[PDB]
């Protein structure tokens, strides 16, 4: 009865669906990913975290502006 | 028309432009990174593109500057344009400007849309749903280009990809075909 | 009166925000000895979040 | 046509498409162990078929990757391309291509799909369920190969045999016939 009722090709299409559907849920977490790092950015800086990193790998030892300024001299090129 | 409203509105449009050039300057330093990491990892045209956008929000970021410029000068000068009836030469720039870019940045910021409202109905030389079209035609060339949607020079995105490549420390070829013309 | 539930509303969010301030800088404190503990055994992300 | 909708899913489908390159990549490297146990165990044509998979696989991910610029590019563009009704040079190749695949991979990624339609809907000038088939006649050449659907060449599955036989360090007799020709 079982094998009748739930088949092999009802299994692999069901299970074909929960990959996709899990497959969007990824995508789905990559866009609240994407807007809550746009999000809370000023409160999370990049180059605040860096320099933490950087200290504490120097304390447990191990190794792992301008910028801008410079690409408005393009612009203004 | 309401004349504080206006204030009030200008005042706000200051205030969400100085927070989105400072989100907008934040995102770009997090995006160099991945732009850099892409040109680290074979992918140019990539890179390119994303440069592209980079570019596309820094131009917008100018942009938003000279809109506050304007928007404070226009502040400033309230009590003056309150009174008189018909513009000054002084204003008429930044009124131009103003109303020409509410419809471009209607979505980032919404008071702007109703500053322009308040100034179309506050006007009526030249002024209206169509007689702004015609008359919005002394509005800033700088700003106007810089809002423009247009594709930048590809030797511009080729000297970015040169100079991030360089920051971030890694290789990268332009093409000489880009970097001749 | 209103005024006076008014201003112990005000003090009580000013006081709530001096302790939320202080739970915030307790588990700063946390977060920096967890990374500290947790990047000894080589984890960069980790380390990163 | 909605824009903010084509925006949305073109954004949707960069993303769709990384996570499904990062996941065809993993897929091969695990593959490609059974292809050389096969190869170890006397059968030679299976594996054979397997680095057809394989190959084929590859092909997609790459096809996938040019897709992933071309839509990356018509983002960029999207403010150019929101305002004018006729699409330019630069935007043609893209646009065609991407209608053109979207029904080959509509099973993987469904937004591809979206993405066409809203570009069918938007354009007139040979647009359509049947001015499309026939103005999709400029689409790129080398996606149009990698995403076609032909038996690869026997010589390149043979290469592939040797070199993964080589990288497990396991032996191969690869077909004289084959290699000579």
């Known amino acids: 009865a079982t094998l009748k009722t739930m088949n092999l090709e009802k299994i692999s299409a069901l299970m074909d669906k929960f990959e996709h559907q899990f497959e969007t849920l990824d995508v789905q977490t990559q866009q609240m990913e994407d807007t809550m790092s746009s999000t809370t950015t000023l409160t999370t800086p990049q180059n605040q975290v860096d320099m933490l990193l950087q200290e504490m790998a120097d304390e447990a030892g191990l190794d792992l502006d301008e910028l801008s300024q410079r690409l408005a001299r393009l612009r203004d090129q | 028309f309401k004349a504080e409203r206006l204030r009030v509105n200008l005042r706000l449009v200051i205030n969400r432009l100085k927070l989105l050039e400072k989100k907008k300057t934040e995102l770009a330093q997090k995006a160099r990174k991945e732009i850099a990491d892409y040109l680290a990892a074979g992918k140019d045209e990539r890179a390119r593109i994303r440069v592209e956008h980079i570019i596309r929000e820094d131009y917008l970021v100018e942009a938003m500057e000279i809109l506050e410029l304007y928007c404070d000068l226009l502040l400033a000068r309230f009590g003056l344009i309150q009174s008189m009836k018909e513009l000054d030469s002084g204003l008429a720039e930044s009124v131009s400007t103003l109303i020409w870019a509410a419809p471009r940045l209607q979505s980032e910021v919404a008071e702007l849309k109703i500053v322009a409202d308040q100034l179309c109905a506050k006007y009526s030389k030249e002024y209206g749903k169509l007689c702004r079209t015609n008359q919005i035609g002394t509005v800033n060339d700088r700003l106007m280009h810089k809002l423009s949607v247009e594709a930048p020079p590809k030797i511009l995105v080729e000297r970015y990809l040169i100079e991030i490549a360089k920051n971030y420390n890694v290789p990268y070829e332009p093409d000489s075909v880009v970097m001749a013309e | ?49």
Request: hydrophobic share 35%; proline share 0%.
């Open chain 3, 1 to 49: 009166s209103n005024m006076e539930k008014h201003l112990f509303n005000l003090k009580f969010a000013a006081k709530e925000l001096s302790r939320s301030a202080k739970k915030c800088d307790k588990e700063e404190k946390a977060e920096k000895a967890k990374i500290e503990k947790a990047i000894q055994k080589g984890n960069m992300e980790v380390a990163r979040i």
